[PDB]
Design a protein around this ligand. Structure first.
Ligand SMILES: Nc1ccn([C@@H]2O[C@H](COP(=O)(O)OP(=O)(O)O)[C@@H](O)[C@H]2O)c(=O)n1
Length: 126
């Protein structure tokens, strides 16, 4: 399968979530930001690159967070915890960014695939 990596950026005990702007099916819904691994890249290479491109921040990539998600027959979606080395995140690509605490994770308007990670995200914040 092709891998899509996503980052759980936790700063000051809150989590960064990112509101998609495209495609139409997911626009307005919220996700862990990331994107597709390209040939030759490690998971950490790809995820750091994507979060530089998408958020303008330099992160260190940490442990896995929650289960792999089988997006479709081609693609596997994997989250990693990341931590902010430097920068403040800005939405280059996304409609909006938000910092959420444990009390907001369950109720958030997630993109379907990411919902699997809700307990794992609540735990990471607590
Ligand atoms: N946290 C995320 C990130 C991507 N995805 C899915 O993974 C696919 C690839 O993600 P993407 O479009 O952000 O990838 P790039 O265009 O950033 O490389 C998309 O179709 C998303 O629906 C997801 O379900 N959850």
């Amino acid at each position: 399968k092709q891998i899509v990596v996503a980052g759980a950026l936790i700063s000051r005990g809150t989590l960064l979530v990112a509101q998609r702007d495209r495609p139409a099916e997911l626009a307005g819904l919220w996700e862990l930001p990331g994107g597709k691994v390209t040939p030759g890249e490690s998971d950490a290479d790809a995820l750091a690159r994507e979060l530089r491109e998408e958020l303008g921040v330099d992160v260190a990539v940490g442990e896995r967070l929650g289960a792999d998600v089988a997006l479709n027959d081609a693609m596997t979606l994997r989250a990693y915890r990341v931590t902010l080395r430097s920068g403040s995140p800005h939405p280059h690509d996304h409609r909006a960014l938000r910092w959420v605490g444990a009390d907001e994770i369950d109720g958030l308007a997630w993109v379907p695939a990411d919902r699997a990670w809700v307990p794992d995200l609540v735990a990471a914040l607590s």
